[PDB]
Ligand binder design. Structure first.
Ligand SMILES: NC(=O)c1ccc[n+]([C@@H]2O[C@H](COP(=O)([O-])OP(=O)(O)OC[C@H]3O[C@@H](n4cnc5c(N)ncnc54)[C@H](OP(=O)(O)O)[C@@H]3O)[C@@H](O)[C@H]2O)c1
Ligand SMILES: NC(=O)c1ccc[n+]([C@@H]2O[C@H](COP(=O)([O-])OP(=O)(O)OC[C@H]3O[C@@H](n4cnc5c(N)ncnc54)[C@H](OP(=O)(O)O)[C@@H]3O)[C@@H](O)[C@H]2O)c1
Lengths: 330, 330
């Protein structure tokens, strides 16, 4: 069989996005085929669509870093999961489509009480936020954590995970509205990067001690401000370059002066061993809290997958607060 | 009593250095007074003398980040150490003098068989190298470790400690001679930063995988080269800014692409708790290997403390291979 999948022939704007009848993949050894109910947009999608962000080698060229669905088929050497079981997955790509193969290790249960659509807002944002906060930035209770793009899907995951880890989430965002949501999800403070200097506001908030952890998906444009409000021994976790990757200035002096760590994370390009570790770590540590202090997947808009174009337009606009989810015909 | 101590009234060149009769300090609570036999030069001394590098608050304004000597007196509340016991210490300053107080936790035994003078070449270089390699850069067996200023005192410590940890030390240095020493101390490779591009040579040596750990005391001037030859997941340990602290270019893109960590270490500015931890860690893990695969303090020149001027001149010249040690009249 073939399947319906989000597709763009040439990179460029959202205009290039359509849904196409494409080859339904086949489970290789040790993976399941997920019949996707929903996949969410990630920023990676916009950049991949723009042709800046080629997918990882081995990963499928189809958009979609995550998917919730039903275990359709099973590859050889499986393994726990039944054919029919609803699950969500972190994917290296291929989620904005009706099927996607997933190594069963990365399949996560859909938390009791959540819809497939809500669950589609979890894998990427939350495994990343979790990766950033625990594995990479090593957040401890009492840490002040500065979360940029606070109402990105990752941002909104991070705010909550920061709280869950007993840490103090400070967010930035470019919208009055977004900050309000951030506060509603647990942000101890929200700074509007268009309206004030988040560096001076953070030091204010932290009584000059600064932040132990910066989750930075902006990078360059925010670098001076970031190192400035970094605490001594502060982990500065760079995981996006929305504000460019260029640096011009005394980053080394400034970072060294703060005994700073500029730790970079990518998750998409990681190997299975790492993702399974993360996903096992996440499944044990974080996932159960989507049912219970309860973790809330933050969905902004749901689109049918045929409206991928308008979904990308919408995220390109930075209008979304948390996850834009795309629903696949079944 | 007063004592003879290295001193500079105004910062500037080595010309400003003399030995002066200064106040002999008094052990505060929980510290010992060390009668210094030898102290070594560190680069910190040249910068402190130049007035770039003020000493830590609380620390003495006298040069000398280390000292070997004899426990002269004991403060109240001691934790082990007797008055007369020979010991060496990591110091925040005050070592290039006839006495210096030290929290007994930072006093380390002088390895059986080493002279006080040789021991004076250990604390700083080796506690730093150890800090950099284990606590900060977390070296594992099999790691390729790129050590810049390979025949700095730290460099020469690091080469050996890298080997001890089962890691592969690659060094850079600006001297044909220095590389030879580096090889003699265990450097798997030596690159001459004046004669070749250490980035292309390192990738060559590492068959394109690059280095898991860069001990970088140069920083800016070497940054492009450094991130270039960094391995995936590579810790880039910045602990000096000899080659400037300015960055101009896509460090973030390049680092993020390598899932690099730019981790900065300072040791001088650390609190006692940290230094004791480090020193206990070092004393348990590394110190015994100065007697036994045997760790060799690398002394280049010994000067009497009255020749501090010529010692600083000598280090300012980058002529030293390993530690320039200064001996104090007794
Ligand atoms: N490397 C990894 O492991 C990994 C994994 C997943 C995602 N990411 C990255 O994490 C970030 C968010 O991902 P997502 O898909 O959840 O994001 P999203 O849903 O697109 O939200 C991102 C938000 O970034 C903010 N932003 C954009 N440009 C900015 C700028 N120049 N300065 C300040 N803020 C800016 C916008 O909100 P406001 O301006 O209103 O706050 C935008 O809504 C992206 O950089 C993405 O590339 C990284
Ligand atoms: N932050 C900390 O925790 C800490 C603690 C102790 C020391 N340090 C730092 O570690 C470095 C070495 O300390 P040390 O006292 O052992 O050093 P040292 O005895 O002075 O040796 C340093 C060597 O650096 C090399 N060098 C100088 N400028 C350079 C440049 N622009 N490019 C490349 N190489 C250059 C020179 O040798 P070649 O050019 O011939 O190789 C020089 O001999 C210094 O940067 C010092 O500040 C840091």
């Amino acid at each position: 069989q073939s399947m319906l999948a989000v597709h763009f022939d040439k990179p460029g704007g959202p205009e290039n996005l359509y849904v196409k009848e494409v080859a339904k993949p086949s489970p290789g050894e040790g993976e399941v085929l997920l019949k996707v109910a929903a996949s969410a947009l990630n920023r990676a999608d916009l950049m991949q669509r723009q042709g800046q962000y080629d997918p990882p080698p081995g990963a499928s060229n189809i958009l979609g870093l995550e998917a919730s669905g039903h275990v359709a088929e099973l590859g050889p050497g499986c393994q726990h999961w039944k054919i029919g079981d609803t699950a969500m997955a972190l994917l290296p790509g291929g989620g904005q489509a009706q099927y996607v193969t997933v190594p069963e290790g990365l399949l996560m249960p859909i938390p009791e009480g959540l819809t497939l659509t809500q669950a589609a807002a979890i894998p990427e944002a939350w495994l990343t936020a979790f990766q950033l906060l625990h594995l990479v930035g090593n957040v401890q209770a009492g840490d002040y954590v500065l979360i940029h793009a606070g109402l990105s899907g990752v941002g909104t995951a991070a705010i909550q995970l920061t709280r869950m880890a007993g840490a103090i989430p400070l967010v930035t965002a470019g919208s009055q509205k977004k900050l309000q949501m951030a506060e509603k999800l647990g942000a101890a403070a929200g700074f509007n990067y268009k309206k004030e200097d988040f560096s001076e506001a953070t030091l204010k908030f932290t009584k000059g001690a600064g932040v132990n952890l910066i989750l930075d998906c902006i990078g360059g444009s925010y670098w001076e401000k970031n190192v400035n409000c970094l605490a001594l021994d502060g982990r500065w976790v760079l995981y996006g370059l929305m504000g460019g990757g260029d640096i011009n200035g005394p980053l080394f002096s400034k970072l060294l002066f703060k005994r700073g760590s500029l730790i970079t994370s990518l998750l998409r390009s990681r190997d299975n061993k790492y993702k399974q570790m993360l996903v096992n770590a996440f499944t044990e540590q974080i996932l159960p809290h989507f049912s219970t202090q309860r973790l809330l997947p933050v969905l902004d808009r749901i689109y049918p997958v045929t409206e991928i174009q308008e979904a990308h337009k919408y995220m390109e606009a930075n209008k979304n607060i948390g996850k834009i989810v795309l629903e696949l015909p079944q």
